[PDB]
Amino acid sequence: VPFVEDWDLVQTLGEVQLAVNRVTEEAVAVKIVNIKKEICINKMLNHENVVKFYGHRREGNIQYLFLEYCSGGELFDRIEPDIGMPEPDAQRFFHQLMAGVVYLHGIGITHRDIKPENLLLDERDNLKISDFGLATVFRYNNRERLLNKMCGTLPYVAPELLKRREFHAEPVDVWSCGIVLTAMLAGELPWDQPSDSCQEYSDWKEKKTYLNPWKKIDSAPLALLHKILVENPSARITIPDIKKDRWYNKPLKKGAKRPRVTS
Ligand SMILES: OCc1ccc2c(c1)-c1n[nH]c(-c3ccc(-c4ccc(O)cc4)cc3)c1C2
């Protein structure tokens, strides 16, 4: 079949460009570029809540990463500033985020930069974890390696990453998911960084929930946030127990609208 390998670059997405197949019209995302690790980790991934990797090509000095096109864009653009989004939408997005993080941790991979800018949505609004540029293997041959590298985005990083030389990988991703949940329900970030010098972080540890952003969040999802945003990473809730939380299993959202007629 001629010209089936030809792709037209039509527009910029983030450099990330939208590529359309000349024959089939299939839309994919092409990342034009550390890189050796990013490609190797992407080759390991296959999950409905993780951005698909189709392959790569090296044209001299420029690397082309052929990745899944998510038409719904970033989760970031679904959060209304100072408001957030309806609680049933946030719960569905957090469910899908947990599925992706369970998968990644299961094959021994930590994302290390979970934030709404890296959580993409497909045509049916399904969440997909993207950007494995900061990702690393924390478990090899069923042996866990403790991390020591400073990775992430300060409002989403766990406090152990700033206070300890070494730390476990999994509680760091759990913490960033908790800040993502906060952003979805309150439309604002609680602190600039989780340090004692940050007044907003100090007030949370002092349980001053009468202040923003916590005053906008209902008691049921707030009780879960009280279990995730725990300073001690050893005392912090694990994903198996997040799945047992009362709000996590609270019926709130209906299914996708489905065409129906009467009489
Ligand atoms: O306007 C809609 C919109 C806005 C922004 C983006 C999209 C779509 C889109 N579709 N796909 C992507 C995209 C962007 C980045 C990745 C990516 C980057 C690095 C990786 O290692 C793995 C995945 C994968 C897909 C985007 C950004």
φ, ψ for residue 186, nearest 5 deg: -120, -15
Flag whether 100 is marked binding: no
Flag whether 75 is marked binding: no
Ligand 1 is surrounded, with C-beta below 6 A, by 13-14, 16, 29, 31, 38, 42, 51, 67-70, 73-74, 120, 130-133
Give yes or no for a contact between 213 and 203, defined as CB atoms under 8 angstroms apart.
no
Q: What is the CATH superfamily name and number for domain 81-263?
A: Transferase(Phosphotransferase) domain 1 (1.10.510.10)
Cα end-to-end distance, the chain, whole Å: 50
Give yes or no for a contact between 51 and 70, defined as CB atoms under 8 angstroms apart.
yes
Q: What is the CATH superfamily name and number for domain 1-80?
A: Phosphorylase Kinase; domain 1 (3.30.200.20)
Please tell me what resolution, in angstroms, this structure has: 2.5
**Which strands, in side-by-side order, build the sheet including 119-121?**
73-74, 119-121, 127-129
Classify 246 in phi/psi space as left (phi over 0), alpha (psi -120 to 50) or beta: alpha
Cβ neighbours of residue 196 under 8 Å, at least 6 residues apart?
A: 202
Flag whether 207 is marked binding: no
SS (H, E, C) 128-181: EECCCCCCEECEECCEECCECCCCCCHHHCCCHHHHCCCECCHHHHHHHHHHHH
Would 1-80 and 81-263 be classified into the same CATH topology? no
Tell me the CA–centroid distance for residue 151 and ligand 1, in Å.
Answer: 20
Helix pair angle (219-228, 170-186), 10° resolution: 150
What counts of helices (H) and strands (E) characterise the chain? 7, 12
* Closest alpha carbon to 73 in 40, 103, 41, 118: 118
Residue ranges per domain, the chain? Answer: 1-80, 81-263
Helix (H, G, I), strand (E, B) or coil at 3: coil
Known catalytic residues are 113
Count of Cβ atoms closer than 10 Å to residue 256 Cβ: 7
CB-count exposure of residue 142 (10 Å: 0-12, 13-18, 19+): exposed
C-alpha 8/C-alpha 20 separation (Å) is 5
